[PDB]
């Protein structure tokens with residue numbers, strides 16, 4: 001679904017949401033339906049070709065699940081690629097917790113369940129996300145949870161190249177990912193570790209060791225006695241939440257549970273985990 005035309009033929013842009021090295025993200029409205037969408041603009045380089053683009057764009061269409069932002073279409077126009085996707089109006093979990101403060105245990109439990117459903121899908125497709133963190137998990141206005149994309153392997157062209165060249169920030173990375181040159185390699189269970197880190201992030205407003213220099217953190221993950229992190233406050237959280245963190249942050253990947261196994265954990269299988277918990281969080285955001 002690549003159109004060689006101006007995306008403004010089909011969409012009215014409404015707001016510029018964010019930017020980066022990747023490019024620009026916009027809230028837009030479908031001119032027929034009136035439905036909101038997100039439009040992501042990336043600049044095309046002279047090196048880039050439409051044959052490699054079509055294949056990359058095809059995978060965006062097919063790697064489909066309720067807990068991953070849905071792809072609608074793409075536009076190639078004036079050396080800019082626009083990707084059209086499902087709108088998640090509350091932004092990322094980072095956007096939310098930086099305003100609301102720490103999520104409740106039930107809110108975190110719901111988010112973790114929803115992310116794990118996405119991961120179980122991706123892992124079943126033999127895909128490693130590699131980028132699970134609060135900033136890459138979006139919330140729509142109905143309180144539903146969506147991964148921004150299927151992770152590092154969803155990135156296109158020069159953005160993908162940069163992602164391979166620079167491992168980036170290590171705070172959510174499994175130690176086996178950090179140490180891939182030095183020890184033996186990694187697999188999809190790195191995402192489970194990342195989810196454990198994310199649960200702490202939502203609880204405490206930052207991942208463990210966030211005040212330590214990232215090169216120092218990366219270095220410490222190489223050494224034999226790297227200790228998995230823990231929640232700082234004992235009394236605030238249930239035994240189930242502490243145990244969820246313990247098991248997701250299992251140091252040995254051989255012993256770390258799969259996404260589907262984690263979905264049977266007490267924390268994420270308890271009743272009353274629904275989007276209403278996040279509707280309450282968004283009502284708190286709106287009406288502090």
Ligand SMILES: COc1cccc(F)c1-c1cc2c(cn1)cnn2-c1cccc(N2CCN(C)CC2)n1
Nearest residue numbers: 017018025038040086087088089091092135136148
């Ligand atoms: C982490 O999400 C991305 C990261 C890089 C490139 C992207 F296109 C996205 C991205 C954002 C998306 C969607 C898909 N992808 C779908 N809705 N939506 C959205 C909607 C409303 C507000 C808002 N934000 C999230 C990012 N903060 C910094 C600003 C507010 N985002």
